[PDB]
Amino acid sequence: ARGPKKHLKRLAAPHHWLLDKLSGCYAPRPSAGPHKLRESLPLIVFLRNRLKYALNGREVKAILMQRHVKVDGKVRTDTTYPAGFMDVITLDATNENFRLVYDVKGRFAVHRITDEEASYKLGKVKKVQLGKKGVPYVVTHDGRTIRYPDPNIKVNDTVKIDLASGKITDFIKFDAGKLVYVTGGRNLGRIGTIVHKERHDGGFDLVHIKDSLDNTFVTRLNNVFVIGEQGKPYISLPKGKGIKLSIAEERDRRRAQQ
Amino acid sequence: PRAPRTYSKTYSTPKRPYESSRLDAELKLAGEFGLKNKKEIYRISFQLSKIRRAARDLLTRDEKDPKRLFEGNALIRRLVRVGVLSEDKKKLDYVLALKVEDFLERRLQTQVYKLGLAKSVHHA
Amino acid sequence: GISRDSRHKRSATGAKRAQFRKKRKFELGRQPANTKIGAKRIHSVRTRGGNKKYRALRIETGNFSWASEGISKKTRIAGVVYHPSNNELVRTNTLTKAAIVQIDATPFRQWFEAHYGQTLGKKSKNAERKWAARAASAKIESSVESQFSAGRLYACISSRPGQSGRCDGYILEGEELAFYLRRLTAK
Amino acid sequence: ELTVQSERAFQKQPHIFNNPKVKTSKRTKRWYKNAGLGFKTPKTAIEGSYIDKKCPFTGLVSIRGKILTGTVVSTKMHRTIVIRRAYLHYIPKYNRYEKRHKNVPVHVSPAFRVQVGDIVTVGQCRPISKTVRFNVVKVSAA
RNA sequence: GACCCUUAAC
RNA sequence: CGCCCGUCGCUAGUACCGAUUGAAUGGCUUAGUGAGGCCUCAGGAUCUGCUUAGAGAAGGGGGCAACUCCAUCUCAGAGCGGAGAAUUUGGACAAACUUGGUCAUUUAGAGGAACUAAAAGUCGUAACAAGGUUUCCGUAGGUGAACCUGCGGAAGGAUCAUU
RNA sequence: ACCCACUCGGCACCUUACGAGAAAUCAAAGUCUUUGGGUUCUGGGGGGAGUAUGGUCGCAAGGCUGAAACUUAAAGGAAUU
RNA sequence: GUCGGAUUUCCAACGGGGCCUUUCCUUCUGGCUAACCUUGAGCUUGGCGAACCAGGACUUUUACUUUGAAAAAAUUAGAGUGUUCAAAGCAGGCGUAUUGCUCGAAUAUAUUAGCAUGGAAUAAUAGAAUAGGAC
RNA sequence: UAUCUGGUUGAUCCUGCCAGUAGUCAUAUGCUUGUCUCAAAGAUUAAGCCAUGCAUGUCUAAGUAUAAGCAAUUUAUACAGUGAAACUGCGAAUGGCUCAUUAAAUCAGUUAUCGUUUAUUUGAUAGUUCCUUUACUACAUGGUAUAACUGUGGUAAUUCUAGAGCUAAUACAUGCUUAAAAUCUCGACCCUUUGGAAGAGAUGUAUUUAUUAGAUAAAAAAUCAAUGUCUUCGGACUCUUUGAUGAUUCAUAAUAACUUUUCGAAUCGCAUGGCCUUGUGCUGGCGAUGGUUCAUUCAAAUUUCUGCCCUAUCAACUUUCGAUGGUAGGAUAGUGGCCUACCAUGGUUUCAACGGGUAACGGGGAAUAAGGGUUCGAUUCCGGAGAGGGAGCCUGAGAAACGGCUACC
RNA sequence: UCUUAAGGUAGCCAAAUGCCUCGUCAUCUAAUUAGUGACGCGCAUGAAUGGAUUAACGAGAUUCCCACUGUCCCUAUCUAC
RNA sequence: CUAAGGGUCGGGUACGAUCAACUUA
């Protein structure tokens, strides 16, 4: 290809974007940004398809150009800024706040969080290193670099940001008996409550997680996002709390509680 | 290019064309129900084939299998909704015994004939 | 041009491979520097991603280290006396990595005098104070000192002049010096 | 396995310095590492004299990726051997298997003594030669 | 003992 | 008065052998010749101090016999502080030829020798009955043609059988 | 050396016989649509044709390996009359 | 007694778990003291261990398990849906007539090699034979 | 929708084909100008050749406009609006097309990079730059070949071009201002009695050595010729600093040094608020574009772990000159016989190597189905390759680019 | 059908053996009584008066091609005797 | 210029100076 691709066909965009087959042949390629290509939601597909605040990409650009939308507190005046998991975005019109979160079935659900909730975001530390001048730093899941972290925090922990500065206000370790979120795999959007982690020295640590309904499952360590201790999660959970209702009981709950 | 528009056939031609017993029955069927083609029978028998295939695979699975518990119930509700099989059953029985006459009995051509506003299948 | 791909090579079974693609830029090679001695001339090479690379021809001086003494100093290179890869590199006096060369030995000798100051064979007050503390350490190795009479030190060069444009190295020491001395003076 | 310095270039471990000023027992300090993954560094590697920049223990190669076992079918290359990996390939049409083998050429450090017939464990390393991507890390012979 | 053959012409 | 074999003759078709060293086309030489780039050895049109007591056409401290970090448009052997086009002046990538090798039914050919068919042709009658010498196999020789004969074998024989 | 009774191994021996087979017939040619003990070789309509552009063995005679074009609606097996 | 409708104790194959029966699923570091006649009211104010834990080179070698961290989407099978039906598509549905709210876009080894405190039945050139064996 | 049927005979049962039968997002073609929705469409032969016309250009409050361009001054006598060009920047490496080559090669499952990143995005990050150096002194801020534009040009002709006078430099020796504190190195004050001063420097980032470095499982004592940042010549010998991985010579320190100046903002817009002894003098707020580095994102390169059709009428293949491995170097972004300097015949092979063929791009898939299968897949998605055939290269982060260049055919 | 002791078989050929004859066809060339290949009622081929073949060999007959050249077009010039 | 290729001794139970000739690459 002689260089990076700049287009994205439909049928090649990630499935969880909930795009249709027809009415166009190019899906919005998310630009380079904090989140990966596949595991990100472009602002174009959010502001347009998720909420129907707009009818097309031109009119989303009109929404964008006036600096009304801002994710993590920053405006992001571009069509395809890749807002990803647990990102907070804000619509100052009537003070509407959004936390990009996973639903039960593995798609980016639409939240409604309050102002004090939208202040903070949760970041999973991807790696712990020290940079130039012996200054330590942690790389979060969204690509943030935070200098001088608490020495007690290691890889696979979860730090919470304030989004008004770059500092870590609080954090939670990775251990058995901690509330976790699944970000990836076929268990996407399920909330886990870690019970065990088996190692496999040399690659792909596995973690066993059982949700509130006593259903246990296994996922790779890179797919686990700790979000709190037992009881209170650090963030507001979505509707359904990630319990993974089966099709039979999802059929019943759809019939009774329409 | 834009993603391809999927399409699928709805009818199936019989393996042996000149069957006296089958030819007589199908033209007998068209008269009693006012259909214009044999393809109007071919599709119903093709629709029935997909249904008997669905129930046959489901019934090979054991009882209290989540697949047939969900897919069998869904097929029952769809078939009861369209009125092809009797509604006073809860045993996944009639599906494999559904005959061709049941499907085109529920068509609007005959539905408005027996509802009294048409007075004939051809008039309907 | 010069290529680095494996597609032209016979397969491990010995089968000749058919051509799959044209030569690509990302698999290119370039001509060697063949670094010589004298009147320093380094041409910049632009590489992948920008990433300038300095190709040394005819280099004069180099930064050479005395590992046992923890010192390094700039010093011109007399010439290469031994090369494991090819003897033509010695004859042509070509400066490539791992070449055995003779260096000036003078900045080390003048540092040795201003650091230890001991007498080969059989001052300020602050000089003599540091002299005493640094005594019992000026007797490194006879095979190294014998080179100081001729004012030339045997040395390896550890940088890649065709890559970095620099001729840097270290003085041959210990068993390594005795190994190359054995080959140098071998009949 | 007769002479360390049988080469035209002085053989040594890079950046491992033995100061000729100091003079103690076991003067030539030799660097070694644990390959990880539960493999044990042989005693022949710790107190051996061989250099072998491609040795998994005293060299600069790192073991990562696939780990394989096989039977040594050749030892006639210097520091390289060929192991035979015999496996069963499934042919679905006949619902049964056929015997298949692959020869993998791997590097064998002088820390090990290997002859034809032995069963060895090899770990993947960076490409070491034209055909070699594996290093012997265990031998099933005494 | 010897003994070969058999319409194109509904 | 069935069936049935081969030579030979006339037509047609298909493929084979074949002197003719055209299979003119179609991938590379451990042969030749090197287009052009790239690296490199050099080369040097092209211009910054335009500072050297020239220059009775610029005021300059004194009573104009070369006393002042000064003059156009003439320029300095001040080394010296610099870029740089044309110019194969070696390499490397690779390319500029009546020439050996191979080939996707893959295209000629006097003549030779088959096969297939058609056919209202000629000669016989080898086989099918003990087919009028049982047949058949292998092998060898012979003969217009089927075929005959020697030697050994088979029954798929014309005998499941003798005291 | 004969006679009876066993037994192991062998050459065989009386049937359109349970079973198998198209039948002839079969002590295996059975235990095979109720289809699987192990394993080697071979065939896929008739002809062209066991005919080589080839290869290989042989002193040769020839052996082994072995097509295609083309052409056919049959050729063939076991019975019955 | 857990809705034209059903309560484990006088009966199901109980699918599985742990303990004895010579049976053994490696045993030891300590800041935690866990099933044990070291015990304040019809239940612990000294001790033996996996429903708890980092400190051993050693879970014979495999094939064949069940289990699934995974067939990119599209396609196929398939759930819902009043495109008039249908192919299709992933839409849509419902109001205080005038405000607004809400369900979706599930779910599924049609070829084969990594993990699996639970699986040794099936099938092999594995161990202690001039002991070099075990504790 | 787990069917079969006709054809050898006088007749029969078989073997076995031929023929029928059904389907084909399989193609063609024959028979037709009256219907709704949906839709393939110069793939097969010729990756054959192309007339013509289009298919890549690009601007903001904010990099340059005195267009001799169009336009009410008192917010536009330095310009402050709009604005053709031209420079600069970015893009043209995306897209789109095609399927020729290609048979462990592409490709698929996306193992590894502890083997190599930085159009860009996102986050973070540079008080070290009088380098003729304790101001012997521009940062209230050292210049220039040239574009546009004006000017008689040359040529039949081209998106051909120096010939005479200003801009951005970011193009070039372009080039300053922010002691700090601490550490290290050497030391210009008198007979010192463990000598002890200022003084002079160096220590930001960008490129070789060597290391107290980068450690670490559990107890009490001996001995060091040149006498422990302390004490009364037998007191404490006292937390002593240490991050990651399965693993490293890793991250990152620190120490000689080396660097032919890498960077370390002389740039731009909007806003002119405020204490003052009225000076841009003390400070100003939002931002745009930054050039470095680290991380991040979008990518790229690199392997075979297993898997590919037919062919033995291909059984041996790999033959200075690579052909398997070693050591070293060179080249590369990096690994690597990738290439250059040697032994050994190393490597592959009936488990089919190596040759030959492919009316062969691979795959997701398609058609056909009782179950197993057989055939197809140029083509809407993914990956690869190519731009008439070869080869070479410039620029650029990325191309061996062809609506870029160079050469031969 | 007459006739011979037998009526020339296998092979081979316008052959160093064919008169006719410069045989006919093909090939070779611009052109070939030459050469080669092939072919016939072979004046008068032919089987140890040996037939056919044949690798290697030959100062042996012959034809063609490449190379090469004063053999020639078309001669000229030089040296010694 | 380089490389390769030879002959002659004192053994407490891997060591060297000597000396020597034309074949290859």
Side-chain angles (χ1 to χ4, degrees), chain A, chain B, chain C residues 1-186, chain D residues 2-142:
Chain A
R2 289 172 38 211
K5 273 177 186 30
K6 298 188 257 195
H7 292 51
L8 178 48
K9 275 136 175 172
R10 269 152 182 273
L11 319 183
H15 196 223
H16 52 99
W17 286 1
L18 297 164
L19 299 185
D20 72 322
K21 306 198 251 142
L22 304 322
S23 77
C25 93
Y26 293 112
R29 173 153 177 118
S31 41
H35 294 86
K36 262 94 145 50
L37 202 303
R38 302 259 147 228
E39 58 241 56
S40 91
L41 200 69
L43 297 184
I44 188 42
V45 69
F46 178 83
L47 260 151
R48 182 177 42 167
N49 307 20
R50 292 301 103 94
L51 312 105
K52 286 87 174 48
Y53 281 171
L55 300 324
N56 38 43
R58 172 263 203 170
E59 155 188 2
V60 177
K61 201 39 177 191
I63 278 179
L64 283 168
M65 101 180 315
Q66 303 135 351
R67 285 174 119 76
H68 280 40
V69 51
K70 49 170 190 90
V71 46
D72 286 13
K74 317 226 198 192
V75 152
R76 306 309 161 182
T77 338
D78 62 329
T79 298
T80 78
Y81 187 82
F85 165 65
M86 207 97 94
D87 260 346
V88 163
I89 93 180
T90 289
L91 296 184
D92 297 285
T94 69
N95 193 352
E96 200 66 280
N97 267 285
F98 286 115
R99 220 193 196 88
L100 266 283
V101 80
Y102 293 126
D103 86 310
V104 218
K105 265 67 144 183
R107 320 160 210 125
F108 262 131
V110 38
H111 264 180
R112 295 297 174 95
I113 40 159
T114 22
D115 306 346
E116 31 261 49
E117 171 123 18
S119 148
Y120 69 85
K121 102 162 299 193
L122 258 61
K124 169 199 198 197
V125 29
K126 283 284 259 162
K127 65 151 79 58
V128 170
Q129 211 76 52
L130 47 55
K132 290 307 151 49
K133 299 168 171 3
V135 181
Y137 75 85
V138 287
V139 190
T140 60
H141 76 278
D142 52 345
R144 286 162 121 76
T145 304
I146 294 89
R147 315 234 291 174
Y148 307 107
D150 193 321
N152 212 299
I153 103 186
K154 302 318 194 158
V155 181
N156 312 108
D157 303 26
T158 288
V159 306
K160 69 161 299 188
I161 328 293
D162 59 341
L163 300 193
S165 69
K167 267 254 262 193
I168 298 149
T169 38
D170 223 320
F171 73 84
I172 34 177
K173 227 166 205 324
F174 186 106
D175 208 84
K178 315 195 139 279
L179 198 61
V180 285
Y181 213 125
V182 175
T183 69
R186 96 195 294 286
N187 287 318
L188 186 33
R190 309 185 54 179
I191 283 160
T193 306
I194 286 176
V195 307
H196 175 67
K197 184 182 88 146
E198 63 165 16
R199 328 299 309 285
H200 317 310
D201 202 82
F204 298 136
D205 271 41
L206 292 188
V207 79
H208 301 49
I209 31 209
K210 76 154 141 81
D211 55 293
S212 320
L213 253 53
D214 261 44
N215 283 345
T216 330
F217 47 106
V218 201
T219 194
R220 265 150 186 216
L221 184 34
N222 61 270
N223 277 331
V224 196
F225 196 119
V226 349
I227 62 194
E229 70 277 28
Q230 304 293 151
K232 198 234 187 172
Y234 276 23
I235 44 60
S236 80
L237 304 185
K239 52 171 60 144
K241 305 319 173 101
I243 315 286
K244 173 98 147 47
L245 286 321
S246 77
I247 58 181
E249 85 209 335
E250 182 254 329
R251 180 256 303 286
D252 298 357
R253 282 205 72 255
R254 191 167 98 78
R255 214 176 272 306
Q257 188 247 328
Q258 88 275 23
Chain B
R2 158 166 13 95
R5 190 149 209 123
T6 89
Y7 68 91
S8 93
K9 258 172 113 129
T10 304
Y11 74 106
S12 146
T13 265
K15 288 302 154 334
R16 35 217 308 140
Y18 307 126
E19 270 206 291
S20 283
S21 109
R22 185 207 84 240
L23 284 181
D24 273 357
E26 253 161 354
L27 182 270
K28 201 195 317 295
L29 221 69
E32 283 150 68
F33 286 88
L35 302 143
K36 180 241 184 149
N37 276 124
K38 253 71 186 284
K39 183 143 141 219
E40 275 149 58
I41 283 87
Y42 293 163
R43 57 141 90 101
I44 268 71
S45 73
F46 183 92
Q47 296 181 309
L48 193 42
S49 266
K50 296 204 280 132
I51 297 196
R52 270 154 317 91
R53 170 172 282 116
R56 193 161 344 131
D57 176 35
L58 283 183
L59 276 149
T60 316
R61 328 193 75 114
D62 61 339
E63 203 58 45
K64 289 146 191 224
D65 198 50
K67 177 99 144 170
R68 41 179 301 189
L69 253 49
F70 192 77
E71 293 212 73
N73 280 317
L75 187 66
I76 288 326
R77 182 208 90 171
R78 296 209 303 284
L79 262 300
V80 160
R81 206 212 208 216
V82 81
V84 170
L85 86 181
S86 310
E87 310 87 12
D88 46 349
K89 84 87 197 169
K90 323 282 219 251
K91 280 96 199 202
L92 212 177
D93 52 14
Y94 289 124
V95 180
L96 281 190
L98 290 177
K99 289 146 279 291
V100 47
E101 309 99 275
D102 312 37
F103 265 79
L104 78 182
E105 151 85 38
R106 297 292 337 185
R107 273 174 69 262
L108 199 60
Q109 209 180 306
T110 70
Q111 196 38 241
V112 311
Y113 162 64
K114 322 170 160 308
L115 273 156
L117 51 152
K119 97 160 53 64
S120 117
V121 281
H122 318 75
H123 186 198
Chain C
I2 304 127
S3 208
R4 274 175 326 105
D5 73 338
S6 311
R7 313 282 206 161
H8 78 282
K9 279 230 99 162
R10 223 170 249 281
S11 85
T13 60
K16 155 166 316 313
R17 280 139 164 173
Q19 183 114 57
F20 160 61
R21 50 158 71 157
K22 290 167 212 281
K23 292 193 198 141
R24 305 298 209 224
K25 211 248 155 196
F26 50 69
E27 47 178 64
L28 67 78
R30 289 192 270 261
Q31 257 158 297
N34 294 322
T35 313
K36 302 287 148 96
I37 301 158
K40 135 156 54 169
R41 155 178 292 158
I42 319 149
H43 285 175
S44 20
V45 187
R46 196 265 190 192
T47 70
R48 152 159 307 250
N51 289 331
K52 208 150 38 44
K53 195 187 282 199
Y54 305 92
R55 177 129 298 138
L57 338 156
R58 65 175 59 178
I59 223 77
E60 268 170 350
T61 50
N63 180 28
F64 284 74
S65 303
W66 203 352
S68 36
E69 304 288 356
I71 42 151
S72 96
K73 214 79 61 213
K74 153 144 100 172
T75 285
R76 88 177 181 290
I77 303 122
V80 14
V81 317
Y82 185 88
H83 203 294
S85 318
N86 186 358
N87 251 355
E88 300 157 45
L89 296 179
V90 180
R91 189 157 82 191
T92 56
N93 275 301
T94 305
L95 295 160
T96 80
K97 179 142 162 32
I100 305 298
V101 298
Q102 297 233 59
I103 59 178
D104 301 344
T106 165
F108 304 107
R109 210 206 51 253
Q110 105 178 26
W111 170 91
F112 192 81
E113 275 134 23
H115 183 271
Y116 296 114
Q118 231 277 356
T119 70
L120 264 169
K122 305 295 190 176
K123 334 284 166 167
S124 145
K125 60 166 136 162
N126 302 335
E128 284 147 359
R129 284 145 56 51
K130 318 201 186 140
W131 254 228
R134 302 185 185 136
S137 333
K139 31 197 83 145
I140 327 99
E141 209 186 313
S142 160
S143 148
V144 147
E145 325 305 323
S146 86
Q147 301 186 60
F148 271 106
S149 94
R152 290 227 172 84
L153 287 199
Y154 287 130
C156 260
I157 79 190
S158 57
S159 99
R160 307 182 75 210
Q163 296 298 301
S164 69
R166 324 271 268 254
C167 196
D168 294 37
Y170 58 91
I171 287 96
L172 291 187
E173 298 237 58
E175 143 169 47
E176 168 166 16
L177 177 50
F179 168 87
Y180 283 118
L181 277 182
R182 144 177 65 250
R183 313 217 46 150
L184 260 201
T185 71
Chain D
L2 188 82
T3 47
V4 181
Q5 301 295 341
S6 64
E7 222 71 54
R8 259 189 228 270
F10 184 69
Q11 303 292 123
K12 87 210 175 95
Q13 310 182 273
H15 300 48
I16 308 304
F17 181 64
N18 195 43
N19 211 333
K21 297 262 274 315
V22 311
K23 205 44 192 74
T24 78
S25 277
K26 206 54 169 64
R27 40 170 101 84
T28 325
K29 49 188 286 263
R30 159 186 211 73
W31 178 94
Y32 62 88
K33 75 182 213 208
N34 324 305
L37 315 158
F39 287 99
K40 183 270 217 313
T41 323
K43 169 206 217 63
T44 325
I46 273 76
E47 312 112 0
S49 34
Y50 73 91
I51 290 311
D52 201 351
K53 80 163 171 189
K54 292 151 168 181
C55 168
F57 308 106
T58 74
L60 307 151
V61 299
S62 71
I63 298 286
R64 78 285 190 273
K66 323 135 181 143
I67 289 185
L68 323 171
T69 59
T71 286
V72 190
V73 294
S74 190
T75 55
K76 273 151 39 145
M77 278 166 330
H78 184 256
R79 301 212 172 146
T80 315
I81 44 90
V82 181
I83 103 192
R84 197 192 158 105
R85 304 230 310 140
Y87 56 101
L88 282 185
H89 175 239
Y90 187 64
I91 291 87
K93 181 184 182 171
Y94 302 100
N95 322 101
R96 54 199 105 203
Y97 305 84
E98 68 185 342
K99 274 206 192 145
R100 275 177 178 192
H101 78 104
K102 296 251 182 97
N103 288 348
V104 316
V106 318
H107 180 91
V108 49
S109 154
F112 308 100
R113 146 163 278 104
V114 155
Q115 46 194 85
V116 167
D118 297 305
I119 276 77
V120 296
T121 324
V122 293
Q124 187 188 334
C125 46
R126 65 152 214 269
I128 284 324
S129 77
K130 185 185 189 275
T131 57
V132 178
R133 284 90 181 97
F134 285 87
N135 255 300
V136 163
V137 282
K138 220 213 258 193
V139 186
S140 297

